Every structure is written in structure tokens, then in C-alpha cells.
Amino acid sequence: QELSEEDKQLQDELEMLVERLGEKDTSLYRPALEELRRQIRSSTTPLKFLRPHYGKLKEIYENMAPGENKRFAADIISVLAMTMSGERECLKYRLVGSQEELASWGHEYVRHLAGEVAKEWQELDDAEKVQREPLLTLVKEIVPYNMAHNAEHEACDLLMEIEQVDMLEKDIDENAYAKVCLYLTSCVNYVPEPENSALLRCALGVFRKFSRFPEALRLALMLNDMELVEDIFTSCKDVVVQKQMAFMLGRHGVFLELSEDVEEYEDLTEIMSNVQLNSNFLALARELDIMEPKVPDDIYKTHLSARMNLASSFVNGFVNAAFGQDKLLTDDGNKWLYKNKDHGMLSAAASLGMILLWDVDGGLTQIDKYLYSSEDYIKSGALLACGIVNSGVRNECDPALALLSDYVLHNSNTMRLGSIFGLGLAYAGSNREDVLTLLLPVMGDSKSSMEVAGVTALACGMIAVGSCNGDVTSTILQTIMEKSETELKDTYARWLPLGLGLNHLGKGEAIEAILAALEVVSEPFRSFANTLVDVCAYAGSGNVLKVQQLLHICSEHFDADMGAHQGVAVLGIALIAMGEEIGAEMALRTFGHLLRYGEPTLRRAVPLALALISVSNPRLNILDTLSKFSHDADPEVSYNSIFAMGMVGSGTNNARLAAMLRQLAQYHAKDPNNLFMVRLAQGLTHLGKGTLTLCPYHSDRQLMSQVAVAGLLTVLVSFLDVRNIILGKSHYVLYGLVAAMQPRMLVTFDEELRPLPVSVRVGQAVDVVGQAGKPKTITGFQTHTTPVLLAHGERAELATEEFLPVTPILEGFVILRKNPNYD
Amino acid sequence: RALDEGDIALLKTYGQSTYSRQIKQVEDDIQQLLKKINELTGIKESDTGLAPPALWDLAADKQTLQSEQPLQVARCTKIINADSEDPKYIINVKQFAKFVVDLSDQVAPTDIEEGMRVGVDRNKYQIHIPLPPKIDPTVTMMQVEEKPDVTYSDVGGCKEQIEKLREVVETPLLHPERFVNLGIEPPKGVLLFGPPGTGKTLCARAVANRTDACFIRVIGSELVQKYVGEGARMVRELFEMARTKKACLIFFDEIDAIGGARFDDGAGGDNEVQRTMLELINQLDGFDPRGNIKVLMATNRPDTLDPALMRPGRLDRKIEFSLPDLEGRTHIFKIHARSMSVERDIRFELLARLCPNSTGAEIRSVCTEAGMFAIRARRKIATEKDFLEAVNKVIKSYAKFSA
Amino acid sequence: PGRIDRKIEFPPPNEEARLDILKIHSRKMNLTRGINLRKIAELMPGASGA
Amino acid sequence: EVPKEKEKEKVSTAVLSITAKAKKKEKEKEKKEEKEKKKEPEPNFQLLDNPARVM
Amino acid sequence: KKTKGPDAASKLPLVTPHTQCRLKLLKLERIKDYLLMEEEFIRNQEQMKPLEEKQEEERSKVDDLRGTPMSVGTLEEIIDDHAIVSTSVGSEHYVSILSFVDKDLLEPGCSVLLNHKVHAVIGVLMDDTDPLVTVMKVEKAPQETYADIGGLDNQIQEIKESVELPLTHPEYYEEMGIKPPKGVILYGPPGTGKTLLAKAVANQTSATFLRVVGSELIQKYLGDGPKLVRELFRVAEEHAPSIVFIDEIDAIGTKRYDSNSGGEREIQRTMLELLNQLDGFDSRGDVKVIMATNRIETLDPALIRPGRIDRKIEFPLPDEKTKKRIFQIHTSRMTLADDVTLDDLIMAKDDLSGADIKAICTEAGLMALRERRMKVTNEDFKKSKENVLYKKQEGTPEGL
Amino acid sequence: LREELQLLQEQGSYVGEVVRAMDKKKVLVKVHPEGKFVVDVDKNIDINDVTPNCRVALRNDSYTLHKILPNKVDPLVSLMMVEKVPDSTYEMIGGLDKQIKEIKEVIELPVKHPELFEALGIAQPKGVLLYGPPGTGKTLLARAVAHHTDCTFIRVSGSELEGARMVRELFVMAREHAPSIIFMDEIDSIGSS
Ligand SMILES: Nc1ncnc2c1ncn2[C@@H]1O[C@H](COP(=O)(O)OP(=O)(O)OP(=O)(O)O)[C@@H](O)[C@H]1O
Ligand SMILES: Nc1ncnc2c1ncn2[C@@H]1O[C@H](COP(=O)(O)OP(=O)(O)O)[C@@H](O)[C@H]1O
Ligand SMILES: Nc1ncnc2c1ncn2[C@@H]1O[C@H](COP(=O)(O)OP(=O)(O)O)[C@@H](O)[C@H]1O
């Protein structure tokens, strides 16, 4: 083999130089290495020739006398070790080396030096803190090089590897901080909890420094630290940032209780209370012309019975939800409930409240007449309708608390159930001390039935979701202890762990104390309760241990039938890491293999986890798999598959999916048990005319709203065993979607808070270039007026650089101000 | 200047990321697990029928095991050739067999007919089960078509063509006067030809106006096929299916390949076409005249073969149209405007004048374009959307003439 | 596609290229001590390795 | 006479990187929160009654 | 004989960086963890059996009656109780299966088992691994998305609207009562065409896709060229409603030749049958036929008419911004240089198409990998221009 | 041996080409006189012991497996239109040194290491054309990189006459090796054919 003539000549020249450097006398050692190093650091701004001289160069470096000659020798060994590395010999030589300016030895060398520093920083033991400072100083020298030469994302990699994101704040300038913070946010989804909080805290630090509060609030909501949310809300002072914070709290649904000393406090609490949510939503619905009450009959396509009529009423309420415009239950509503049979009048009135949800003024007046109804079920449904109306939306005088005064602890089981569920939906996320101090004593009542006690626990859990309310947990545990185990573990105690999971939602770690106190409970219910509270607390964390513990326990034979907790393990499989697309599309495939070879109880609970992964997101593979498994032999499996399709298509108005359900309705026309819930799935698909989505992931589909997932999980827990409970009595548990029902369109205001007709470009927004933490790139600009339905996969962007939003996140509400360069 | 060996490995290790080798090992393990879990399947059994048939229909499979000695008369099945005066049956078998048997005592000689497939029991080859297959390939399922074609306003009524064919198709099906007042049988045939256009729409209208003996749309291009005898058999089963379906009309369409051109290149170019011609004449010769079945042949040009002079005794009454005038075009506009969300307040007569002899297909096309322009404007209204109706119809007439 | 990657062409062997092909083909064979292979190849007008 | 049988049907948990990364985090929390009678005495020093099957 | 294929692969192609970094590493670790937890889950579940119930009721009743010896044969016809099956060497059996009878999966023309001796069907080979007569659905629903192409916003919006008239808002023209399968007639320079394919993948993000390129001047006596596509489009209607991409045959296979008779029978058959299928009054289905060509002149007058084939779309040459976007897309995977030499290569360039952009980007890496191997080769700033000349544009004597 | 003769009176063993090895001790097998015959698996060989694309011995009536015979399909039809890897080393190739410097870069580099091409971003070298005069230009460096890459020596002229099918077996199945150069000779298909 024959190299280039000049390449061979230079190779022989370097061979002569190294032999001269390898000679006996050291008087020529210095001149030889002076000549050598100049061309060694030539190609980096050569290394092939000195490939077989590894041992000789090591001997020369060791033989070199201490001083200048030795540290250049260590310099040459280091810059050559990047090729001849059987170990991190580059860094060990460089630590012995000069420690002068390294950045001039080529980009390849400094990048390899940066990584070896990261390896040593991780490798060094706790007792070794001598060399840590020199590596930190070396890191603080290479970060400016990475910032200049667009290497900031790997600079973030090494600083997070060495846990020095605190000085990442001090070094990064705003000119490139947006992509660094986006890179941090992406890493947040996968890093475990202690460094996850560390990256969240530093992300707040960067945005607080750079006056980037609107996205900082998004990150604060990820941190679920209400104290930090209050601190950063105080930190920002401008009127524009104050009012966008209140939209974000209002859109999230959690009410922030503050003082009137702040400027424009009345508007801030109003927009946080979502008082104008209903007015804007109806106004945009009218502007789209989507206001006509869609009859359940022509949804069914009847061109070719008491429970079936009930399902028709429920889907009508789902379609006309948040609207308040439906004469079917308003004019002849009394006739319909009178014609209705048995237990369905409560749900029909609650469905009417679903039509009137978020319509406080309109709903209360139109439900006042039905409040004085004769039947106990109608009265209870009317009271539940009031709670649905006041659910989500906050009010200054809070009419729900005064309206539900005698019914909060009323002796009648049905009347108490409606009020308790109504207060739970109303005070969901309010965390109000007065509401808690009035409903927890109702939890302590012994006259209430087992299911009534469970509903009280559900209400307490959704009110105090993600609050770690100690007295709520103590009452929950005390009520469980007082109740006898034999009657506890029958079919309805499954709500008590749900309240515990909601109260400790997104916290973790401390759950060991709760499960230790719960350890006294017998195995059939303890093994279910401890798993449910664990998965709910560790939801949205990517803790793939908690899923594999679920996978291990749901694998057991478990065949009195304690194997029911295999189902909550399946729900926990999706619940832990439903956050991003990864951890959801593959746990989806896990559910496929669960159905592919699994227990009857396992395959009963799998569609519930499938719906939890992609609620309101009609993924084609999900819809096909659910449709194929909707005809399984097990009736409960078919029921779960029917409901799963309704949830994944909920609030989408997906035409082809609706056709599939209509085909399923024809298939299941003979059996009403599947038929009425196929109708239910269609109503879920057309719920709110598709204007309100049901996915609990908001703020660019990366924030977990505690109230919405609380109500969603309550429905899925109920749908663990609907083969018994929806057939029997739980026609009221389906109304937990109010928390998860949030609008998915854009409402644009201005600095004077008036609706703007500003047009935006909307289309698929998926990553194209991954060279750095670049913002998600949108394609398919189908621009039109600002009311646009924001679904999964596709986002919105301003048509021109003329209106500057308060936050680049474009969903729900946003204020657009005139750009200084607008012309 | 290749300088690759050794050098390429060094520069492959020259740069990279700090853990590029790590992710490579990670993704190789990802692919290793992917193959392992594709090998570690779920239902790892190609044979299906796991339990729904293997729990209760299995219990009756015990019954068929108790009756396993019977129900074994399957063996092999083959056609029959002919027979003697009565008892003996000389048969050609798919085993090339010169086969004769005493027909099984359970089977009378009346049921078995020449050219029908019968299974033979290997022990004695008795005529046990004479299967009437009546198997239809997928293309034949296309030759047969829907019966209820649904009636319209004479599908853009061209009063000449329809009224000439009603006395030859509708009247014989009504059978009010064919027997006595007019000579024995109605006119022997109908040739509803014409340029691409109104052809066969009047046939569909006559099908809807008549009884359930409804037409099937067969294509001559489909009928001509590779090899020899397949087209002959296809025409035979075409007549069999039409005869069985209440003696329905047989609608031959695009007769320019089944009859071919007026010539054959060397009598070897299109000879299977000639094979189909001989058998089709043998089928639609009628033999004994019968006012039950009807036949209609529709092409665009009179390119029929030499039987074009025998057909005056068999296939007479050649009629055509496909020449819509102003009154024809505006009536086609009215029946098409019956569909969609349009109303006749539009001055559609102006557009009928604009397009001279625009068939009925283009008028349907123009109406389709008008609906497409309405949805493009996002207005589902079309009753009063007449100016927009006129605008889209005239601009597309411009595009059709010159684009 | 499938051919846009490269369109490498084969030049007919030159007199020196033909010389080398004789050497490759005549290395296996035995012959006289003296031979002017270069002139032998150059005597052939054009031709190819075949 | 004694089977000493166990029908476990059990297999372990295959958990590798982000499992083990927070398993390392659970490891971070879990850190704080017959010879004298068998050598000599084989039962061969017994006494038996006068009915005794002995070879 | 074919309905669907098990899609349990393509594990989350959304690797956001696509380059070696810590974020990509963590995503791969989460991917690889999730694979083991599944292999955990299924293995733990398959062996930790819920219950040991005899011989799973399999070997007790059916496996013995299925027998050890078996032979495979096709199933021909179905009757109420028995089954008419055409086994090997032309054998036909009229026997009632009652063991492992999955009536949905048996179907006519599928391989079934025969237990020998008293020949009774006892099972069906559902895989059968041999539906190989005419295969065009093998490349169905291509994974290419909108993001793969850029700078073609006007055409992407136009094609999306033409194909989202169905699926999205199907009641729009359902109330208008037209149900138009007009399709799209695509123009474009000969330097493009698979963009006519790449812009088609925008609609291929929904449902399946079929391709007929080159085909033939259907000399076949049966013709059936456009007619088996009609059957395949019918099969597409059975599946998710697919599109038929017939680029370069709407021009050659459907040519506006002045000749009337004696024209290879394609004008007689192909053009007429194309119009019959493109007319909504004959065939239903949400199938949209995308007609793409590089010769607008050869448009047949039947194909010219927007009355049956509407939604004419013209593909123009890329502009300066479009050239910047396509070069960015093609060079994003390769990390061209740290100096980002982007506009110098396109500012003066004219008449450069997508295929040329891909070729020059590929040749830029090849020339650097030839001998200039420097990771992000510092020569790439001008070698990208060196291989953008590359001659090979057009060559024909002198004539000038 | 007499009992072996009596066993072989029932044909002894029947040769079968194993294709599919099902989990329930089932192998499809192919027998030359008839073809596929689904059967159980012998006791001496487990379910995993069955190796596809090999030969096996069956029984007379039940056709139960007897012994997994070594390869018989490969020796019989080894040479149809293809060839395995020859040596034909590049040392024999001469006078075209300035040309193989491009073939090695365009063919040897992707086959030896596609990781660098994937890291390069451009990793689609698929076809080389290799035109020249007759004589020098027949088949060489199609047998040199064959040994340098250990792919194949599949040599098809293209002047065989239907063009459909045929190549499908060589494109996937009859490769007999994941590395494949599949060298085609002069492209007899004229422009536009
Ligand atoms: N008189 C008419 N009135 C209404 N529509 C017509 C009329 N003539 C033709 N059409 C329309 O033309 C299209 C096809 O017409 P028709 O079924 O008569 O012909 P075809 O079978 O397609 O063949 P050909 O055009 O060669 O006769 C249909 O959309 C039909 O509505
Ligand atoms: N504007 C573009 N942006 C991104 N990729 C493109 C663009 N144009 C073409 N391509 C890609 O380059 C390839 C060749 O494109 P095209 O010009 O359509 O091929 P051809 O010229 O051979 O018909 C296509 O496969 C397509 O994916
Ligand atoms: N038939 C032959 N026998 C021996 N050597 C040959 C033969 N044909 C050509 N050669 C030599 O081997 C080399 C082959 O190159 P070439 O013919 O271009 O490859 P290919 O035939 O695959 O195109 C040439 O330098 C030539 O001198």
C-alpha cells in the first residue's frame, strides 16, 4: 500500500524527530519537542503518523524532567490520547499538564476534553474534592467556547452531568437561552425526580433572570410548587405579565388566592375565575356557526328502551355541553324525566347541568325550577347539575356552597350523593378550607352507605388534589379502619385509595408513610389501595420501576378474587409516563401484548389504559386495535373497548371514527348492553361539538392539570368494573369529565382585553431539524380567523410578525399586542 | 488518493460524541430486543379456532367423530360427460378417467345432468353427491350488477330514443299485445348504440320501470381474455345467471372486442374472439322464440361482425341518440338539479345554450363542479347560489373547451 | 436512482496499462530471460485486456 | 416421602436504564430509609428387640 | 386474501435530535427500558399463569381428533354445515369442519389442513405466506410526512384541501350531494416527479397508497390495465380508502395523440376506462386518483376536462427560499459545516430541482468522504459548489 | 439390518424439506413426490431442534420426523444463474488503478462500515454503472470487490427471454448472504425499451 509522496516524506520527517526526542541526551529533548508540537496542533485548527509510537511517547513524557518540558510532554500525550485511548489518558496527562488556554488545540480536542471531564466528575468519589475544582474551572472555560461555537446543548449536557446548572444560569446570555431552556425542558421529561426538580429550578432561574415569566409559569406548573408560583407572580410586575399569569392559572383551573393590593385585581381574579370563559366560548361557537343543538337522533343516523333513551339523553348533554342552549331538556324536560324510568332521572338532570356547565348565571336560573322537583332522583340530579354548572369556573360569592346547604349531609342517600358530587366538582382544585371542613365531617358520617362514603372520598380527593392534605388522609384511613374489612372489600371501597392518590398527586417519596399506615389492611384491598395511591402519586414521572412492579404483580396468578388489583396496575402502566409521546406509544404496544396473551381481568382493564394514553387523540393504530378487540368474547372487555374508542375520539368529531361506531351500533343492535354504550361512545366523540378537548395535557400538551386527570382517573377507576357498577347504579360517575373538559381553541385579547380578529397559521407542528433545541417547526399553514380547534400534532403560529403574544405558547387564551415595528 | 485503510477507522474514532458509541450499543440492544419480542410472539399458532369452536362446536365435533365413518364420500369430484338411454353414464373425469358407474341408490338419474360435477366415493366411485357448484369468479361478480337501479325522470328524457325502445323492451315485458295483435313475438332485439353519452342510461331507466328481472352490465373488453374457452364459458354462465335471475335482460356493452373489428388479421390474430362469437350466437339464437328473456347490445360505433346481417332476424331495432339539443340539455339540467342542494331559480337555460351538444355526462359533470365550487366557497347552500352556480359552470365550460 | 450514485467509465487500456496486464498474465507463465514486454504491448494498436 | 415442591412460575424483572437510574435513586433511599450431631453420630448405635430383620 | 398486516414495528421514529447528544441518549434509554419492561411483562405474565386448568382443553378433545398426519389444501366453497375445499392434486372434499373452525379466518381460497385417512378439515393456515399474484399494497401508507418537504406551501395547501374534502368534512358535499372523486392533475418540470410523490405523502399520512408508474401501453388483449386498478381501488375501499398515484402514465399511458384508430388499443381501452373510474356516477369510494405528469401538453381531452377530473394543480420550480429550505432539509442530516454556507450555493442558481438538490447533497458527502475526510470538512464551503456544478446538467453536441 | 430392510419395505424414511417449524411440535415439510405434509416432531429432536431451510427424514404413513438431513436443496440448484464469492483479487486487476480508487470509495466503504455514512448523513450508495468498451469491461472488479467484501458473484446478463419474476428470488431469498453485489452485465434493455 502506497501513501502520498509528500505524506510519506513528512511521516519520515516526524519519525526522525521522535527518534531525536527519544535519544539519550536531554539537551536536544527540548528543541525536538518545540518542533514537534507546532505541527501536532496543526490539523486540529499528523496524528496518524504517531499511531504506533504510543509506548515510546509514554516513556518520553515520563522521562521528561519536571517543568516546561514535562507539561508540554503531558500536553502532547493528552492531545494524542484522543486517538490512543485505552482509558482517559488525555485527562490524566492534561491534569498533569499546563492548564493554560486549551481552546486553541482544535474543536475535536476540546469536545473530547469536555466529555472526559464529565466522566471523571461522575467517576470521582464523594471524598475526592481536590481535583473537582480544576475540572470545574476547565468547564467554566469551555462553556464560553461552546456558546460562541454553537455548542451550547452539549455544554448543557456536561454541566448537568456535573450538576452545575446553577452557573449555567450565570453564563448563558439571552441571545441563545431560548433553545437551551427548550433543551432543558426536553430533558425534564426523562430525568428522575431529584435532578428533574433541579433542572426545573434552574429553568425558573434562567427565565426569572431574563424576564421570561410567562414560560416560567409553565415550568412552575410543571414543578407543581404553588409557593414558587406565588413567588414568581410577585416577582413579575408589569400589567401585561400579570394578566397573562391569571389566564394561565385560569386555564389550568387552579385558583390562586391573593390580596387586592395588586393592580387591576378585579380583572385578574375574574379571568382566573374563568367568568368570561363561557361568554367567549359561546361567542366563538356562534362565530364558527357551531351552535345548533345537534340532536342525538341524527347522530345515531336512524334512517333504518328506557336505558337506550337515557343514553340518548346523556349523549345529547355531551354534545350540547358548556352551551346551555338545548330545549330538549328545557321546554319538555319535565315530560322527558317523567317518561323516564327508575334511576335515570338523576342522570338526565345532571346531563342538563352538563349542558349548562360553566354557565353560572344561566345555569342556576334554569335549574332552580327543577330544584323543587318532587322525585328524590330529580332533586338529587338538579343538585348535581348545580355542582356541574359551578365546576371548573370560579365565582366571587361561590353559589354552590350556599345552594348545597341541607343536601351536603342530608339523610337521604341519593340527595346527599348529588350534593357531595356537586361540591367535589365545584371545589375541584379550589383547596378551600371551608369546603374541606364541611365535607370531611360528611365523610365521617356512619349512616351513609358504602358507595356514599366512597363518593365523599372522591369529592375530597378531587377538591384536595395534589395538596397532601393531612387531615383528609387521616379521615380516609380512620374511615377505612372503622369500616369492617369484609364489607369493605366487596365492590365499592375502591374510591378511598383514589382520594389518597389524588391528594398526593405528583408528589411521590412520602407515599411510603401512607402505605406503611395502610399496611394493617388485609391483602385483597391493601394490595389494590397501595398500588393505586402509588401510581397516582408517581404519575407523569417516567418511573419505569413503578410500572415494572405493576407488571410483576399483574403477572401473578392471583386466583376471594384478589386479582382485581391487576387492573389498577394496568391503569398505572399508562398513568406513570403518559406525559410525552414516548412512554405512551410503546406502553401502548405493551397493552397490545397484554391483550395478546393475558388474563381475563387483565384484558378487561387494558382498553382503559389505552384510552388513558391517548384520550381525545384519534391515533389510527389505537382505533384499529380497539375496534378489533371490541368484539371479544368477554362482555366487560367489549364494554371497555367501546368506551376506550369513545374517549380517544372524545371532543374530536372524527368522521371516520364516528362511522366505525355507527357500524358497531349496527353490529350490537341486538344486545342493548353494548348498544347503549356504543351510543355513549358516539356522544363522547361529539362531546361539546368537539370544541372542548378531554386530554389532561395542556400548555402545548406537556402540563398535567391535576383536576382534569383527577376527574379522568375517577372515570377510569369506575370503568375498571362497569360490568357491575354502571349496570347497577353508577349513572352519575360519568359526569367527572367536567374537570377534563377544557376548550381547545384560541381566544385573542389585547392590552384593553377585547376580542381580536387576528389571523394565525395553524397546521402540523413536528420537529424537522434536531441540530439543537430548536422550537417545534410547523407545516401546513391553513390560516384563518383566530377561533381554531387545536388538536394533537398540530399547533398555531401568528401569520405575521405584527402581533406579539404574551407567551409563545399559543393555546386557550392569549393577548396580542402591537409590535413596535408593526406597520 | 484513496488512502482509506487504517485512516478511515482513525477518523471514525477521531470525532463522534462522548457517548456516540454508547447510543450505538443502546440501539443495537433495542434492535436485539425487537427481534427477540418478534420471535417471542403471543398467539404463536398459525392454526386458529382456539376455543369458541373448540369448546361447544367441538362437542359436536365428537358427534362428527362418531359419524366419521360416513361423510367420507368426498374423495374427488369431477364433471360427467354423457349417458346411455338411462342406466349407464359414460363420464370423463378429472383423473382423465373413462369412468362409468351405477349411480348411487340415493341419487336418481334425473337430477344428474351432463356436464355437472359429481363426487365419487373411492371404494366404488358411485354418483353420491352431484354438486351444483355455480361458482362465480370475482370478475363475473362484476359482469352481474345490481337489480334495483331506481327510477328517475327518464334519466334526462330524450323522448325519441326512449319511446322507440319502450315498444321493444318495456312493451314485451308488459306483454299486453305481443301474442295476437302483432306478429307472434315482439321485435327480436334492440341495439341501443351511440357516441359516449346517453348510452345505457335509458336501459337503466327501462330496468327500473320494469319488473325485478333487472339487467346486468357486462363488458366486451372483460369478455375477451387470455387462452381459449374461458370467454366461451364466461358467456355461458352469463346466460345461466341471467336466466336464473327471473329471466332478466342481458346487457352487452362495448361490443368492439367480442365481435372484434370487421376483420381478423390472418384468422389467427383474434381467434378466441371468434370462439366467443360462435358460442354467443349459439346462446342468443333463441331457438324457440320466447318473450321472457331480453338482450340489448350497446356500442359507440356499428363495428359488429358478419352476424350483423343475421341479427335482422335476431337483433333488430338499432337506435341511437347521444345528441342533446337545448330542450334535452335543459331537462338533463332539471333532473340533475333534483339532486344536490340546488333550486331551479337559476337561469340554467343560459348555460344549456352556452354548451352545444354537451351530452348528459358533461351536464352531470357541470353539476358536480357547481357543488365543488359551493364547498370550495364553504357555503353548503346552493338553492339561491345561482350566480356562483352560473360562474363556476361557465368557467369550467371554458376549461373543458380549452385548458 | 440506482444509477445516479456514480457513472464510472472504463477507458481502454493504454500502452503502459497493457504492459502491466502482460506482466500480471505472464507472471504465472514461464518464458525466455529477455523480452521487451513494453514494446510488445505497444505493438498492439489499442485493444483491451481480453 | 416429602416432595418439597414449589409452583412459582415466577421470573424476574428486566429493567435496565431509566428503571435502574431511579432504582439507583431507590438505592439512594434504601441505604438509610448442626455439626457435632452430624460428624460422629450416625444412627448405628441402636438396640433392637428380638424380632428384627437383620441380614 | 389480504386484509391487513401486523404493525408492531417502527418504534417511535421521533428521535428529536437525530444526532449524538445527551437528550437523544436519554430517549434511547427510555426506549430500551420500555422494551425490556414489555419483555418482562409478557414473559412474567405468560409463565406466571393465572391458572393450571388441565390440558388447556386443547389436547383433551381437539388435538387428538385433529390427528398427527396432515396435508394442506385450499378451501374453495362454503355451504351451511359442510365446507367445499379443494385440497392438493385437484382433490375436492365436502366435509363439515367442527374442530378449530374459525369461520372468519377460513375464507374461500385459503390453505386448510386435512387429517388424512377419513379426510376431514381440522384446521386452517391463516398466514399462508403466499398472496403473490399482483402486489401493489406492499408499500402502503408510506411513513413520509409533511415535514420531509418544505417551501411548497401553496401546493401543500392545495393538495391537502383537495384530499381533505373527504375524511375531514365529508358531510360538506354529502349535503351538496356530489361525492366527487375528481382527483388531482399535477404538472411539473421533468427535473421533478417524486416530489409529485413527496407532496403525495402529505395525504399518505392518512390511509394507504398505491402506485402505477410505467405500467405498459396495455398491449394485453384483456386490457385491464386501468381496470385492475379499479379492482385494487375497490380493495382500497375495503381497506382504508387509498390513493392511486399514476405519475408518468397519465402522460404516456394516457397520451393526447392525434391518431384516432390503429393506436395500440390504449386510446380505445385505457383512456375510456380511466374516465369511467374517474367518474363518480360509476364507482363509489373515497379513493382519490392523483394524476401527476411532466408533460402538460399531452393531456388527453377527456383528462383535460375538469368536469370529471377537477383540481388541476401546477408544480413550479423552487424559489430562493424554497431552495434554502430543501437544502436545509437535505443537509440537516449531514451537518454540512459550522460556517453554514447556505445562500452562496443558491443565490445565483436557477432551474435546480429537488432531484438535483438531493444529488448534489449526496455528492458533497461523497467527495468529502473521498479524501477530504475532516468530519465537518472545511473544504465543504466550496466543495459544495464544486459538486453543484458537477457538469451533467445537459450535454448535446454544439449546435450553437 | 433385516429389520431395516423390513422398515424400508415401507420406504423407510421419506425425505422432506423443512420450511416452517410451528411451536406445537409441527413442521410443514416439503416432499418431492407430493409436497407439503404437516406432521408432528420426533421425540429425539425438540421443537427448537428443527432448523428451517434444511432437509429431514419422514415416516411412511404418519410421516413423523426421523432425522434432520443435511442440505440437499443447495447442492442440487447451487448454480442456476448466480455465483458465490470468488477470489479474483485486485492484484490481478491492473492498468485501471486510477479507476478502482473510485470503486473502493463508492462500494467498499459503505459495505465495510455504513456507520460512518450514517454519521456522514448521506448513506445511500446503491448502484454503480461501469460502462466501457467490450473486452476490458466484461466481468472484473465484479469479482475483486466480491472477495474484498465477501458479498456474492451473482452475474446475470439481462439478455434472457418473461422478464417478470425470476429476479425476485435473487433480490431477496436466493441471495444466500446479506452482503450482495449482484453484478449485472451489459444492460440489454435499450432506451425506453
Ligand atoms: N340523458 C341523460 N340525462 C342525464 N344524465 C345523463 C344522460 N346521458 C348521460 N348521462 C350521464 O352520463 C353518465 C354516464 O352515462 P351512461 O350511463 O348513459 O353511459 P356509460 O355507460 O358511461 O357509457 P357511454 O357514455 O359510452 O354511453 C352518467 O353520469 C349519467 O348521469
Ligand atoms: N422541495 C423538496 N424538499 C424536500 N425534499 C425534496 C424536495 N423535492 C424533492 N425532494 C426529495 O428528492 C427526491 C427526488 O425528488 P423529485 O425531483 O420529485 O424526483 P425526480 O426528479 O426523480 O422525479 C424525492 O424522493 C423527494 O423526497
Ligand atoms: N478475459 C480476461 N482475462 C484476464 N484479464 C482480463 C480479461 N479482461 C480484462 N482483463 C484485465 O482485467 C482488468 C478488468 O477491468 P474491466 O474489464 O474494466 O472490468 P469489467 O470487465 O468488470 O468492466 C483490465 O485491466 C484488463 O486488463
Coordinates of N, CA and C and ligand atoms in Angstrom, one line a residue, chain C residues 10 21 25 49-50, chain F residues 93-96 135-142 183, ligand 3:
Chain C
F10 N -15.0 3.1 -18.2 CA -13.8 2.3 -18.4 C -13.0 2.8 -19.6
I21 N -0.8 -5.4 -17.8 CA -1.6 -6.6 -17.9 C -0.8 -7.8 -18.5
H25 N -0.5 -11.3 -16.4 CA -0.8 -12.5 -17.1 C 0.5 -13.4 -17.4
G49 N -7.7 -5.6 -22.4 CA -7.2 -6.7 -21.6 C -7.6 -8.1 -22.0
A50 N -8.8 -8.2 -22.6 CA -9.2 -9.5 -23.2 C -8.2 -9.9 -24.3
Chain F
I93 N -6.0 -7.2 -11.0 CA -6.5 -6.1 -11.7 C -5.4 -5.1 -11.9
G94 N -5.1 -4.6 -13.1 CA -4.1 -3.7 -13.4 C -4.5 -2.7 -14.5
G95 N -3.7 -1.7 -14.6 CA -3.9 -0.6 -15.6 C -5.1 0.3 -15.3
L96 N -6.0 -0.1 -14.4 CA -7.2 0.6 -14.1 C -7.1 1.2 -12.6
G135 N -14.6 -6.3 -24.2 CA -13.3 -6.9 -23.9 C -12.9 -6.5 -22.5
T136 N -12.1 -5.5 -22.3 CA -11.9 -4.9 -21.0 C -13.2 -4.2 -20.6
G137 N -14.0 -4.8 -19.7 CA -15.3 -4.4 -19.5 C -16.3 -5.6 -19.5
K138 N -15.8 -6.8 -19.3 CA -16.7 -8.0 -19.3 C -17.2 -8.3 -17.9
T139 N -16.3 -8.8 -17.1 CA -16.7 -9.0 -15.6 C -15.4 -9.1 -14.8
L140 N -15.0 -8.0 -14.3 CA -13.8 -7.9 -13.4 C -13.9 -6.6 -12.5
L141 N -13.5 -6.7 -11.3 CA -13.8 -5.8 -10.2 C -15.2 -6.0 -9.8
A142 N -16.0 -6.9 -10.5 CA -17.2 -7.5 -10.0 C -16.8 -8.9 -9.4
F183 N -23.9 -8.4 -9.5 CA -23.4 -7.7 -10.7 C -24.2 -8.1 -12.0
Ligands
LIG3 N1 -10.8 -12.0 -20.1 C1 -9.8 -11.5 -19.3 N2 -8.9 -12.3 -18.7 C2 -8.0 -11.8 -17.8 N3 -7.8 -10.5 -17.6 C3 -8.7 -9.6 -18.1 C4 -9.7 -10.0 -19.0 N4 -10.4 -9.0 -19.4 C5 -9.9 -7.9 -18.8 N5 -8.8 -8.2 -18.1 C6 -8.0 -7.3 -17.3 O1 -8.6 -7.0 -16.0 C7 -9.0 -5.7 -15.9 C8 -10.5 -5.7 -15.8 O2 -11.1 -4.4 -15.9 P1 -12.6 -4.3 -16.6 O3 -12.6 -5.2 -17.8 O4 -12.9 -2.9 -16.8 O5 -13.7 -4.9 -15.6 P2 -15.2 -5.3 -16.1 O6 -14.9 -6.4 -17.1 O7 -16.0 -5.8 -14.9 O8 -15.7 -4.0 -16.6 C9 -8.4 -4.9 -17.1 O9 -7.3 -4.1 -16.6 C10 -8.0 -6.0 -18.0 O10 -6.6 -5.7 -18.5

